[PDB]
Ligand binder design. Structure first.
Ligand code: 017
Lengths: 99, 99
């Protein structure tokens, strides 16, 4: 699809067996969601948001389906006011910003 | 132009007689810049992100130039660690996401 930006660019992905609505965020390096149920081990990561640096859980090799592509990706889980998919996943699906 | 996302999408904008490097950010509802003095009246706003709320000043109808287009636009000014242009300005220049 080609999406204009008058509305927030939200799409539905499948992650850890669940459908989740997520904002496509070109200013995010990483994909971050709050309070999702992902199995297995994780490591601590510190990310810097607009308000400061925040501790999150980093899950590697997570199967996601986005825009009908099935990939594996890194997913961070932690306090965020919006569940976002960042450039790590947007590049995986070949997304571009056009103008 | 068509920008892939393996890199952060950083463009220059001319504003307030300054040249600033800004992230083109589909996750930001509105542009926010840290180090800049803009003339005139403004209204206080809180914006919400990772790490909590940030207090900003909202300036309306600010002349800027980005991607070769002169427009007037809403600019938020406050202590963001990274300057971004948001969907308000991206829509004024016809930016879209494609995947
Ligand atoms: C979290 C989003 C809903 C909102 N943010 C825009 C977002 O693109 C920020 C923009 C951003 C970028 C860098 C530093 C601060 C803010 N990126 C961000 O927080 O990304 C985090 C996830 O990946 C990591 O890589 C970058 C920081 C981490 S935001 O900066 O809080 C923001 C909120 C409201 C407005 N009007 C403008 C910006």
């Amino acid at each position: 699809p080609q999406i204009t930006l008058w509305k927030r660019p939200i799409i539905t992905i499948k992650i850890g067996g669940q459908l989740k609505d997520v904002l496509m965020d070109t200013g995010a390096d990483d994909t971050v969601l709050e309070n999702i149920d992902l199995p297995g081990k994780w490591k601590p990561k510190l990310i810097g948001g607009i308000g400061g640096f925040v501790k999150v859980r980093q899950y590697d090799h997570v199967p996601v389906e986005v825009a009908g592509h099935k990939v594996t990706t890194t997913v961070l889980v932690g306090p965020t006011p919006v569940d976002v998919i960042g450039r790590n996943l947007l590049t995986q699906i070949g997304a571009t910003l056009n103008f």
